[PDB]
Write a protein that binds this ligand. Structure first.
Ligand SMILES: C[C@@H]1C[C@@H]([C@H](O)CC2CC(=O)NC(=O)C2)C(=O)[C@@H](C)C1
Lengths: 204, 144, 125
RNA sequence: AAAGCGUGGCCUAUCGAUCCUUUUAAUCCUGAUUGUUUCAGGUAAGAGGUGUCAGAAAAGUUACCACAGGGAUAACUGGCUU
RNA sequence: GCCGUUGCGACAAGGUCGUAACGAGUAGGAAGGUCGUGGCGGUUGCGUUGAAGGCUGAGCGU
RNA sequence: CAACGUGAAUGCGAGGUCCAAGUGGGCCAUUUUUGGUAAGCAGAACUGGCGCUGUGGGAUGAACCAAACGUGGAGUUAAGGU
RNA sequence: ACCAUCUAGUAGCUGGUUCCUUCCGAAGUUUCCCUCAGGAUAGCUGGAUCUCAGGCAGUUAUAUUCGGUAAAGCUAAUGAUU
RNA sequence: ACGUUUCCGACCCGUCUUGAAACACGGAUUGCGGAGUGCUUGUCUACUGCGAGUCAAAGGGUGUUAAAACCUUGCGGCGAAAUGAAAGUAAAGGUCAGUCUCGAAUUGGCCGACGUGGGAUCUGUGUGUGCAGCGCACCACGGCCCUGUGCGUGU
RNA sequence: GUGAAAUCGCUGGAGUGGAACCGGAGACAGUUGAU
RNA sequence: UAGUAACGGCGAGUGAAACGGGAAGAGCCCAGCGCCGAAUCGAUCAGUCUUUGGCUGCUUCGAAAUGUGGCGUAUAGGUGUAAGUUUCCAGCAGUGUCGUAUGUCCGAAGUCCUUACGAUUGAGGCCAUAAACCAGAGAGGGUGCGAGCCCCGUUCUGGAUAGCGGCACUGUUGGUUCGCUUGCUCCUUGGAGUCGGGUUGCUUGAAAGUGCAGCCUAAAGUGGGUGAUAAACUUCAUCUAAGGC
């Protein structure tokens, strides 16, 4: 029997919730377990990076996020072709391939092409058989510097830059920004009705 | 803090502060928000007007990202300018503010602008915001 | 902003503003005059601006040493009734001519907006 | 003619929430892959009714009976009244 | 006369003191408790020359 | 803006906001009063009580008369009495 | 029927509800409810306090008002009636 | 002082109840156990830190008195903007002086969070008290601005 | 191990007319203190 | 995200997902079309080896053309051609390098003096300014309650030893490799009582049908599905169901 000014109750506890209870007392244990797994993987696959395959640069889908970038599943076939890497070579060299992703814009393609080029520049390739090096294979004093990389490979930078101060131009000042926005909205809203009127006029 | 609850002071008194006549008895009025229309009608109408009934268009699977549009007032714009940019903006140069990078999509014209003209880049502007910026001597630039 | 407004008034330019309320920084304030203030706590931005503008910040014991009887003082405080909790105080939301804020889980067309809030549903108060 | 009077009946009774349906209103808003027209849904005002009238959808029997209580409540005594 | 509450006040004090009036109480609400019990982080000590527990005289506290 | 200055008695500091308990069976009495033949019956009005309350008196009593309560002392009384 | 489990089934109903002092201290009334052994609501009550330092009062005075009961009248209207 | 004897007082507790010592119910006696809790979600209140910000999640890095502590966030929650069913729109005026097609016009300066009354305090000045000035919080009465809607025009 | 209360037996004292217990105030017995 | 969109005698109540930040990350195989066309496979026999299983065959039977194997699957694929580039598996032995909740063995210092006790581990003293001694061991337990120093133990990111594993390199046995990528050329490219529709029942937040199933109906080939309000006519966007690891 609620009394006085209250916020109406909303608790979802009318089910036999005591049968389905999950506690987090093992959070530090899980943290330690994952650290140990990472260490074991690093030992297993040394000197290769612990993170694993190299991932691509992506733009977040929706307009709420499209001003940001993040890591992707892999590199598109167009991107690999532009960077001059075969899909098989990427697979054996440790580059993620996104067989589903396709490029529709030169800027997006070029960003990942540059990422691939930089990774190839930073790559160190050990001889297949230590005794006999081959072509494309890294040099001995380069191999002496090889060390395991921890964290993301070629991590992205999320720093925000401020545009340089400039001068306000009269062409800029003369524009009617609000009227322009309202005009665009009106044009989009009334496109179809205008087409119908034009068709009716043509028939007449 | 069990040592500070009423239970510590109610020991020795038979009714535990719930009365001898009324008594503390389970659910004497019903469970939850029951009877909001019959016997809790006065309380419901007094403290939660508008509760019963339905009003407005119903949107199957609302798309909240579409309507997401954080706003910044014109009075708050200068505070977004870093001190280094303010130092650089000298001799007729106005600082440039990228509201979309700062996390604001629309600019609303509440308050007053500083003496320094500003260039503001946002997806949307209000008419008053545009008027105030241009009057202060800056410019408004639309971005996608 | 309130501190500056108090100090800019004719005759208050040299008096010390005394407040037991925390002095916060106002981003909407563009020009900050020279302020001499005694307070319990001053935020980082407000303190930086006050000191940069040539002002002075002292504690309550320093104020006691300066003006033991409170001479040349301007007593100020923040708005007491400006609280979200105070928004909910007053006549109940469901009584005539009441602008009290209700306790609602969320905001939207589906949260206490139908019956007793518009004439199209029973009545409106 | 005018000053004036007129939002129903000279005054004190003669009546109805939510949801749903239905009608009227805008050269209205929405259907979120782009549009047109149907269709559907909305904003505003009415009607369809709850007479237990602040508004559940509702026939009996038990002497075969049961449970929680009640001296807040009857049948026998006692008490007041006659 | 003493105890305490309330109001006021003095004093360099989470305290002491002074002063005037006051003191019923079920349901109920608050405050104080160096009233009592069992743990933990600390601190102070006692103990086979006798701890806890148990029985019971001299006192203390409304 | 200019002038005028507290315009019956007595008593006394005043006002504001928030959070919340218990209660939502009452009963008695002077006077008024409806139903009833009446009722220690049923139903109302004002006020005071008991409930929540002890104390002196009415031999005894929830309500009657006196008077309300820290713990003690001296003196004097109320109603009532010798 | 019996056994185990759902199941510590629900109960507006009955019973119980465990230390001491100090301060304040009620209600059985209004409205709505398939409401009448129950709730919500206002009232009564406690606590936190905050803003101030003369306008208030379960009392009178002055001034002005409202009423249709007691009394009075039916040789005044209505209704009885010698 | 739970011994004895005197004088005064002295009905059995708990409970429901208008009313209990009741011919109302429970209580033969003693020991031990025995009942407002946990959590989720709100709200108010008190305290603490910071403050237009605050808290940061999962996670990562480190840590061997390693389930602790310490470091670490383009992003997330709450707050900073409301209003409408929605499309959408979205919170700066005060004063002075002008032109005028004298109107539901327009222009320019100064000031910039509005006006008035009451306001602890502060300041000045007379004689515990008076007058004047700047006025916090708050209260009262208004004024403007945003959005929805009715009427209603035009430029 | 300890070894409580209820209940019970013994020895000594004291009371003992249809309850017993209890509060206030003395007395007795008793206990205890006196540079 | 979020107690949000949505469902609900729109009452009580119920109630997700995408985007975003992270943990981990690995890709692939068929049918069909096309080419080779039995090039494939099981038992049995005989050799051979490192034999609770493997390798060879004019062994003999059988499965398989109602089609086993090779290439090949949406990122396609294939032919030819020009460039570049070209091994991979499994076992055995050795060499070290590293882990073992794997066994066994190994360890620093007082039972010193006085005292207390039924019994000490209790109290005091043990050169030295800083002192009984050890301490990388002052965790725990036992011993006549009390103990780092009496014992087992504890610390030595402990040692020695035997065994199990994983690694890296050498040797060696068996099997296997006409491939692989990019450019050009020509050819080629796919799941049916299934999808879809009607109706019925259950189910969901899914609202003119979210998922599932019964009955009737029952496809097509730039076809089919989806784009959350049903239908036609239109812009497109995005995947490729009815097979598998
Ligand atoms: C206007 C009146 C009422 C209406 C309808 O039955 C009322 C609703 C009310 C409700 O909240 N839930 C229901 O299931 C019924 C109707 O068809 C007719 C009787 C006419």
């Amino acid at each position: 029997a609620p009394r006085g000014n209250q916020m109406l109750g909303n608790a979802h506890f009318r089910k036999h919730w005591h049968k389905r209870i999950k506690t987090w007392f093992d959070q530090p244990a899980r943290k330690l377990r994952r650290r140990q797994n990472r260490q074991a993987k690093a030992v297993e696959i040394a000197p290769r990076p612990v993170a694993g395959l190299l991932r691509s640069v992506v733009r977040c889908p929706q307009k709420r996020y499209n001003t940001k970038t993040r890591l992707g599943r892999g590199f598109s076939l167009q991107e690999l072709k532009a960077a001059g890497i075969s899909q098989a070579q990427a697979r054996t060299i440790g580059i993620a391939v996104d067989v589903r992703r396709t490029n529709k814009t030169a800027e997006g393609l070029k960003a990942n092409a540059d990422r691939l080029k930089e990774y190839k520049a930073k790559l160190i390739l050990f001889p297949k058989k230590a005794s006999a090096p081959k072509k494309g294979d890294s040099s001995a004093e380069e191999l002496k510097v090889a060390a395991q990389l921890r964290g993301d490979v070629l991590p992205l930078s999320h720093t925000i830059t401020f545009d340089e101060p400039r001068q306000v131009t009269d062409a800029e000042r003369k524009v009617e920004i609000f009227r322009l926005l309202r005009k665009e909205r009106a044009d989009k809203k009334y496109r179809g009705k205008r087409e119908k009127r034009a068709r009716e006029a043509a028939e007449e | 803090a069990h040592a500070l609850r009423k239970t510590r002071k109610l020991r020795g008194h038979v009714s535990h502060g719930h009365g001898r006549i009324g008594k503390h008895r389970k659910h004497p009025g019903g469970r939850g928000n029951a009877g909001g229309q019959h016997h809790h009608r006065i309380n419901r109408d007094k403290y939660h007007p508008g509760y019963f009934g339905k009003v407005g268009m119903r949107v199957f699977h609302l798309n909240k990202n579409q309507h997401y549009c954080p706003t910044v007032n014109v009075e708050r714009l200068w505070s977004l300018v870093p001190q280094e940019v303010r130092d650089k903006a000298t001799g007729g140069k106005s600082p440039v503010i990228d509201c979309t990078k700062l996390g604001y999509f629309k600019v609303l014209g509440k308050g007053l602008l500083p003496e320094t003209p500003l260039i503001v880049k946002a997806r949307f502007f209000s008419h008053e915001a545009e008027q105030k910026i241009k009057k202060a001597g800056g410019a408004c630039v639309l971005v996608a | 902003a309130k501190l500056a407004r108090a100090v800019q008034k004719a005759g208050n330019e040299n008096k010390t503003v005394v407040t037991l309320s925390t002095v916060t920084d106002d981003a909407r304030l563009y020009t900050v005059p020279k302020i001499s203030v005694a307070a319990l706590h001053v935020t980082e931005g407000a303190r930086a601006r006050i000191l940069a503008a040539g002002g002075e910040i002292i504690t309550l014991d320093q104020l006691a040493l300066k003006s033991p009887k409170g001479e040349n003082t301007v007593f100020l405080q923040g708005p007491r009734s400006a609280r979200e909790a105070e928004k909910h105080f007053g006549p109940a939301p469901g009584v005539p001519h009441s602008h009290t804020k209700p306790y609602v889980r969320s905001k939207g067309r589906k949260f206490e907006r139908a019956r007793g809030r518009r004439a199209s549903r029973a009545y409106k108060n």
